[PDB]
Symmetry: C3
Subunit: 333 residues, 3 copies
């Protein structure tokens, strides 16, 4: 009986950060309430100042990561303010029935709705907008995120021993298809409704103009690099709602990887690079052994270094020469 | 001694349906005879009335699914009527030797041949035409199907307990590369021999013009949606002879997935989306928990909703509110 | 203490061959010294005589395969002669820290350097050049190879029983992006520095002009096909530094496949085709059961047969009719 369950309200954080949660559940099954407000906005996505009309959950690309446990109930209230122009909805890959909630959540601007579903399967999953006849348009404009459904006893390794992470980050990778003039210059629009027909043409090439982490080229660099220390255990959640990607930590590994993101499966060990199919969320666990700068990339290196799919980790701590050392520094021969 | 074995003749059905078979073998090893007749024909592949010259096994795209057990012998008689214009053959990914049968099955129009091979490895596999110097041309014109080699004791889960399916469907996904005029209009040809040189140019872009299930855009919709009921266990066999795909059931999951299609491996559990490499057949097992319409798609959503890679399931039965419910229907805010 | 360890010098061979090594280590942990000399050169990559400026490790595409055991130390001396024009470096996916060695190995022409790292994780891994701001350029010009880190007790099957291979081959697959004139003709340059800006434009289409094994179209054919005999156990190491590939042996299988190349994981069994993500090395083990010609391909068949990703195996020995036979040879109907 659902009225007898505990309720908890969770206030969501902006990616790549993740809202507070427990790995091992310290309570029984709850009804966990979240609220998201849809926000259509102008977004500057590269260093040349290219501008798209983004469709966002809670004003970010990607949408924020929601974290529950297995057999909790998720109760999302979804708000479309009348300052938006389009009909929107939500489809949870984590849910069972009604096109993932899509059929039940259709909100015109100035409407709201509340959905409940039981999270019956543990793993990281994609959520995304999916209105009838305009699904790729909304998803490739940034209207996607993820949800993590932890097992009630947390994560385990390929042996079934606990794996406890010290930090967790969420990396949403997004393929944009910006329309181009005859000479290849990026076009600009005043309304998202304006862009539509050119967007369909652009998408149909299957060749994105940009692929970025956290909504912009260099969004996870320098000032905004991800931080860790040597000896910390980090979980990186990574989603792609529409296209395949192949993550890789430069100077590191995926010690434990769930490449298709479902925790009832044993992880893959010692991965250099892993494939996350389009429409999936995955997770990699790593213990940092060395300090310094790392690059985290999609390892189609054209997609990384030309199109924008690259971020940084800056890691404090002691250097270990047994692992690696320069015997002879670069010198005249 | 092969003359002492039982023979059985099987008459094949048109996809997405599958010919009658036993999951658990009720006989010892058999020689199972099938016949296929090749058919070059005109095919209308989208709602605008675009026409290709298809090269088919038994008049369908995809070719029909053949079902045997491990260590049965497959004896295929292959017929190329003199109403066709090209040389054809067959390559079974399930077989060992002679380029999968390709080297032994080269038939000019008005020829026939019979091949036998032992099915030594259990799984779903691709078969396809592969004549010398024209292989992608024949495969991307629709000349591919699959064969399922069941273990003699049927399917098992990640624990080795029986998995029994109630229904089974075969979804062949096909990338077409239709040649285009200077303005991007789809060209038309009278003979397949006419199309050849433009086809090579089209294929070389690596960008398909269409990606469809069962030979046409919307072939598995409305009138022709796949059916099931709540509580039935359904096996979906899905092949792609030439290009990667990433299936996903909208509103559902792959409870048990063999993404690369080989049953001696344990399945992957609780998959939202899975990757089937080009040149492979895979299989997903699902128990429907809710009634209603589901969409089954390639989850590059551009490929699904713009290019044609989408089908429907319509599922009869009782709704379960514990799994999902609308708390507040979309309403004025 | 590292000064007390044995040293061994290994002289590397040109792919697809692999330098002598032991599967089971007959010594304790060693410091294994290799030397590579970088070589920028002109390369003819197809039968039309298209010419690129290749950037190579030791004069080949791919670079040679290095073979060590787990917890050996790799000590590479890297030489950039002053007959080259670019700055280069090396990034080992097998190593931990300093962007895989990249940060420590930056050598201008006429410089050298020596790197040591401990190989702490068993598997096949990619190595490649990765200088700041020009990474895809160097990698797609051919500046990549692989290293195999065997477990000290060699390979095991999904049960943990020994797997011993009789032969081993290394197949490096390379995507080239040759720049094209307005009419689609392949341009030619005198210096690699000349090509740069057109290369960036070419790469950004994400559509390679060629995809080849061992540096050229038909490099592993006829004269240069890979050899084996019926009953031999062959290990095929296959890498792609930048783009996904889907290997497949025509007429055969991957009896045991590590598709992401890491040996602490159990292999996948009976694979028809497997996915190697871009930025990864994988390995397939097969026992040949039949003699004759086999084709080994990327099973996007356009990529194989139009763009160059196809090689041959020619296999001596006795034919087994129980596995496959022609009952009726192609004949008039
Ligand atoms: O080794 N990273 O490109
Ligand atoms: O959740 N399906 O696109
Ligand atoms: O069956 N090989 O294309
Ligand atoms: Cu939307
Ligand atoms: Cu989806
Ligand atoms: Cu054919
Ligand atoms: Cu094939
Ligand atoms: Cu270089
Ligand atoms: Cu790399």
């Amino acid at each position: 009986d659902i009225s007898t369950l505990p309720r908890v309200k969770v206030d969501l954080v902006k990616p790549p950060f993740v809202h507070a949660h427990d790995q091992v559940a310290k309570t029984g099954p709850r009804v966990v309430e979240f609220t998201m407000t849809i926000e259509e906005k102008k977004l500057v996505i590269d260093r040349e100042g290219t501008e798209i009309h983004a469709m966002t959950f809670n004003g970010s690309v990607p949408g924020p990561l929601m974290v529950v446990h297995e057999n909790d109930y998720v109760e999302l209230r979804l708000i479309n303010p009348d300052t938006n122009t389009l009909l929107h909805n939500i489809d949870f890959h984590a849910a069972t029935g009604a096109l993932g909630g899509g059929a039940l959540t259709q909100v015109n601007p100035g409407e709201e709705t509340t959905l409940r579903f039981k999270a019956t399967k543990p793993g990281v999953f994609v959520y995304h907008c999916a209105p009838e006849g305009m699904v790729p348009w909304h998803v490739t404009s940034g209207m996607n995120g993820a949800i993590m459904v932890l097992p009630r006893d947390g994560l385990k390794d390929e042996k079934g021993q606990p794996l406890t992470y010290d930090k967790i980050y969420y990396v949403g990778e997004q393929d944009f298809y910006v329309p181009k003039d005859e000479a290849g210059n990026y076009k600009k629009y005043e309304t998202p409704g304006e862009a539509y027909e050119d967007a369909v043409k652009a998408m149909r090439t299957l060749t994105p103009t940009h692929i970025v982490f956290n909504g912009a080229v260099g969004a996870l660099t320098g000032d905004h690099a991800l931080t860790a220390a040597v000896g910390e255990r980090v979980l990186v959640v990574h989603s792609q709602a529409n296209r395949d990607t192949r993550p890789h930590l430069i100077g590191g590994h995926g010690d434990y990887v769930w490449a298709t993101g479902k925790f009832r499966n044993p992880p893959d060990l010692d991965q250099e690079t892993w494939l996350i199919p389009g429409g999936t969320a995955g997770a990699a666990f790593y213990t940092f052994r060395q300090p310094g700068v790392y690059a985290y990339v999609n390892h189609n290196l054209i997609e990384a270094f030309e199109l924008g799919a690259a971020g940084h980790f800056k890691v404090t701590g002691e250097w270990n020469d047994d692992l690696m050392t320069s015997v002879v520094k670069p010198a005249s021969m």
